[PDB]
Amino acid sequence: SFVEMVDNLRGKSGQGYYVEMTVGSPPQTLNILVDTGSSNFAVGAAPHPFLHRYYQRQLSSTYRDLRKGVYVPYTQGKWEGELGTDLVSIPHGPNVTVRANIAAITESDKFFINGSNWEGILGLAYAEIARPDDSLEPFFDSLVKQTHVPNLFSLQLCGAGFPLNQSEVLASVGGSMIIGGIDHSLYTGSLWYTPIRREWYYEVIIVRVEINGQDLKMDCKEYNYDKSIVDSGTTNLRLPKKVFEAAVKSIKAASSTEKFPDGFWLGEQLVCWQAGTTPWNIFPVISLYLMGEVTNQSFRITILPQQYLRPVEDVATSQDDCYKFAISQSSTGTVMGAVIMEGFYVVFDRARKRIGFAVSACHVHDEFRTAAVEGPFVTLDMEDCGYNI
């Protein structure tokens, strides 16, 4: 049942978590990135240096065609291709097969990643943000319409933290995507849900931020200007320009004893410490409060620095441990990326227009602190925190 979907994702925050799927009759196996930050199902359909395989449209008995092109632009990366449909399957997912819209990517810039080990992308967000337009039923919509698979999914993403190599991205277990349900063995404590403000991105509303127990005291709108989303396909936690400066100040200050290249805080440069020397305790926790399910009720998730200091391999290719700053600046709203998701079991309860958080079974723990999901809290005028035009 759901056991068979446990551990069905591979990858890392920096390059994406992917799932295995087949497409076409006869079936063609492909690794697909799992993206809650977009709407389109797309796959390589023509050679590319970073692609170890691709979708041959002309070998599927079942490939239909729409003779309609598509362009999809992301914050970074973009692709162009031809629209058709085909039968699709998830070996380590539910036992069903659906005919779903599929973009065959013909041309692309900055979208496929060197030795990422995926060749496609699965946009799980809602039709409203699908290209060329909504009419284009995203995959999950198809799956729910054509089958008895319930309308929700869960994502438990894990980051292993000794920089992962390409022979380790195959070997590592990055996580689990439970289709059509919640697997209770994969989290502890209880689930806290925040409503999905609107069904396009999975867009939530942040009502308070604290760093090591201190409120930034900003007007909430600032936290959700012009939106906050949950995006498995974005690596970093991306804050809007004011919130970002505020958080960086607080974090610099808290970590004053030590010195970092000015490009460190822009997430351009690494920092390294003697292996197992890194002074985690001088980096603060960050608590995000989310709108709850009941009037004047909030809850919070606490992010450890282990998450916002992402690991990567040395400039000398030496043992001592290195990291990139996984908090970055946004001109297009708050994005709770994979680093933020890594700690948690996240339920995308599309059916009840909500998203739940609980501490993940996976989450790595620093000695004296622990990631948490706690409530209830009281918070007034939460609707005022949503940004409108």
Binding site: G37, S39, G77, K324
Partner: peptide, 4 residues
């Protein structure tokens, strides 16, 4: 690193 990846970025919608």
């Amino acid at each position: 690193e990846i970025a919608x």
